[PDB]
Design an enzyme around this catalytic site. Structure first.
Site, mmCIF file in Angstrom:
data_model
loop_
_atom_site.group_PDB
_atom_site.id
_atom_site.type_symbol
_atom_site.label_atom_id
_atom_site.label_comp_id
_atom_site.label_asym_id
_atom_site.label_seq_id
_atom_site.Cartn_x
_atom_site.Cartn_y
_atom_site.Cartn_z
ATOM 1 N N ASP A 94 37.591 -48.605 10.177
ATOM 2 C CA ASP A 94 37.536 -47.643 9.084
ATOM 3 C C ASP A 94 38.215 -48.336 7.909
ATOM 4 O O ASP A 94 38.722 -49.445 8.042
ATOM 5 C CB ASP A 94 38.273 -46.335 9.380
ATOM 6 C CG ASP A 94 37.572 -45.327 10.280
ATOM 7 O OD1 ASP A 94 36.364 -45.520 10.517
ATOM 8 O OD2 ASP A 94 38.255 -44.454 10.854
ATOM 9 N N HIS A 127 32.981 -45.691 5.314
ATOM 10 C CA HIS A 127 34.252 -46.256 5.710
ATOM 11 C C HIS A 127 34.130 -47.761 5.850
ATOM 12 O O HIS A 127 34.280 -48.275 6.919
ATOM 13 C CB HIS A 127 34.716 -45.566 6.970
ATOM 14 C CG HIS A 127 35.468 -44.298 6.737
ATOM 15 N ND1 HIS A 127 36.159 -43.998 5.583
ATOM 16 C CD2 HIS A 127 35.717 -43.275 7.570
ATOM 17 C CE1 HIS A 127 36.756 -42.819 5.712
ATOM 18 N NE2 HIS A 127 36.497 -42.362 6.901
ATOM 19 N N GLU A 178 30.479 -38.497 6.489
ATOM 20 C CA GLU A 178 31.217 -38.302 5.246
ATOM 21 C C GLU A 178 31.252 -39.598 4.430
ATOM 22 O O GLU A 178 32.275 -40.284 4.386
ATOM 23 C CB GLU A 178 32.657 -37.912 5.576
ATOM 24 C CG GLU A 178 32.836 -36.921 6.720
ATOM 25 C CD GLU A 178 34.280 -36.911 7.209
ATOM 26 O OE1 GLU A 178 34.607 -37.840 7.938
ATOM 27 O OE2 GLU A 178 35.078 -35.980 6.873
#
Length: 515
Positions: A171, A242, A307
């Site tokens: 990430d 990410h 996301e």
């Protein structure tokens, strides 16, 4: 009272005693050459020595079923993960089709002995899992745990009889999986200028941080370990979003290379994607999804799709030259057309796909069926209707209950963390991933449950277990125990008495339950 309540069970009269002052012998029955017989027993016997002293070897004739006390027969009409553990004051018939079957049969059994060993009653324990997806997953992206530990989370996965380990190699905040056509991603990716993480208010602790990462042949140790505890391991790499980690250190692809990017010390959301609209930013990916495959022999790769804002696409005139090519006007769907490519191009040498379930968010008709969502925000309703009802398998990391990485109690010296008390233990097996789920296909496209951990505020051994434990179990019981025999009232009890473990083998553990 063994653990992750068995499907089906019986008792019988007055008890055996192992006898190891002389022994309580073996009798594995060959076929499936070696594989899971003697072999995955040989690491049994040794189970351990330090409790009693097994002492099995053969002293007599292990391999005659005629004065043979603990017999390891095969009846290959048994399902794989399924075991049939008869316990009598003569011995312990344990059947099993597949070593996987048989591995567990002596787990229960063990815990049927005293909580240490020597002294069981009688029983028959037919038992099998609702789900073979009983999952964990470790945010090792914001942080490295050492392997002494990583191992010590597979340790438990075992007790409560889950199989996969899923792994968050990457990430923003760091990247923790060595790619050697791209060492930088780990030399600069993996490093960061701070222990900690912001998140609006919290600061960083301008003190460097590292052990960087996990060299390939620090995987092939790991990815090996599991197999004797049959823990297959989804590699994951949040792709493309990410990726600050893997952009700051290879920006030329990015969506502004001229613009001074760097690893991240706070938390939450980044937008800083792998400009997925430039056929080398791709290669980059595609050449990663090579490296994994080799080291991870498990037929999934988890790719995220979670996301990720489109921020830098909108204003990137490659990633709006492609968006005419593709042929559509939803700009999520590079995430379609970036993930598309991952499938059919890792469908020419072999491996499949998983994702987070925001990636639904387009016309999720562009990819493939044949793709295995893993949802969390609207849980049940997330692996429901444009996943099961459009034939995409699916998991359910119930955000609610089953992110066993939220503060487990609002008490006023529980450490920092996100939550609101709203996740404790009356709350996390009670959470029902079979809330009127019609079976039509929606339970041959549901694959199961998985008990992720999210590290932001949580970064030392003690306290991750302190959070993790016991809840891990709950996700693992439900995981295994079938939703007909599932009420807590007598869960608590049985599973006070699994703290005497968490003690012996140096596991931190909450207690809340425990007096």
């Amino acid at each position: 009272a063994d653990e992750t309540r068995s499907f089906w069970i019986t008792c019988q009269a007055g008890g055996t005693k192992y006898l190891n002052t002389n022994t309580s012998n073996n009798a594995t029955v060959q076929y499936a050459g070696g594989n899971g017989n003697w072999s995955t027993f040989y690491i049994y016997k040794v189970i351990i020595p330090a409790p009693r002293g097994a002492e099995l070897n053969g002293e007599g004739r292990l391999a005659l079923s005629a004065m043979d006390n603990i017999s390891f027969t095969t009846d290959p009409a048994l399902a794989e993960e399924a075991y049939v553990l008869n316990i009598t004051a003569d011995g312990i018939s344990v059947a099993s089709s597949t070593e996987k079957g048989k591995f567990y049969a002596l787990q229960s059994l063990a815990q049927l002995a005293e909580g240490n060993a020597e002294g069981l009653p009688l029983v028959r324990i037919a038992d099998k899992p609702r789900f073979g997806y009983r999952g964990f997953m470790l945010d090792v992206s914001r942080h490295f745990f050492s392997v002494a530990e990583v191992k010590k989370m597979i340790d438990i996965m075992a007790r409560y009889k889950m199989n996969v380990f899923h792994w968050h190699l990457t990430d923003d905040q760091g990247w923790r999986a060595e790619i050697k056509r791209y060492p930088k991603l780990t030399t600069v990716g993996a490093t960061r200028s701070d222990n900690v993480y912001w998140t609006g208010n919290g600061a960083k602790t301008g003190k460097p941080y590292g052990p960087y990462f996990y060299t390939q042949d620090e995987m092939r140790e790991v990815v090996a370990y599991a197999k004797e505890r049959h823990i297959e391991v989804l590699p994951e790499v949040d792709m493309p979003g990410h990726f600050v980690a893997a952009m700051a250190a290879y920006p030329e692809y990015s969506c502004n290379p001229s613009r001074a990017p760097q690893v991240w010390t706070g938390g939450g959301i980044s937008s800083d994607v792998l400009n997925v609209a430039n056929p080398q930013a791709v290669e980059f990916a595609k050449n990663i999804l090579d490296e994994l495959c080799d080291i991870f022999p498990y037929p999934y790769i988890h790719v995220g799709g979670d996301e990720c804002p489109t921020t830098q696409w909108e204003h990137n005139d490659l990633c709006q030259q492609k968006y005419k090519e593709l042929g559509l006007t939803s700009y999520r769907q590079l995430q379609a057309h970036f993930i598309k490519d991952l499938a059919d191009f890792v469908a020419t040498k072999n491996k499949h796909l998983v994702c987070w379930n925001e990636a639904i968010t387009a016309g999720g008709a562009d990819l493939q069926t044949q793709s295995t969502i893993m949802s969390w925000n609207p849980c049940q309703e997330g692996v429901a209707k444009a996943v099961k009802k459009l034939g995409l398998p699916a998991i359910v990391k119930g955000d609610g209950g089953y992110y066993i990485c939220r503060k487990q109690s609002n008490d006023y010296g529980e450490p920092s963390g996100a939550g609101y008390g709203n996740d404790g233990v009356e709350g996390c097996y009670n959470y029902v991933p079979v809330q009127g789920m019609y079976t039509q296909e929606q339970m041959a496209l549901v694959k199961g449950v998985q008990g992720t951990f999210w590290t932001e505020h949580v970064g030392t051994n003690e306290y991750l277990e302190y959070l993790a434990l016991p809840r891990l179990i709950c996700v693992a019981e439900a995981g295994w125990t079938p939703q007909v025999f599932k009420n807590w009232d007598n869960f608590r009890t049985r599973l006070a008495n699994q703290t005497q473990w968490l003690d012996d083998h140096g596991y931190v553990y909450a207690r809340h339950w425990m007096p």
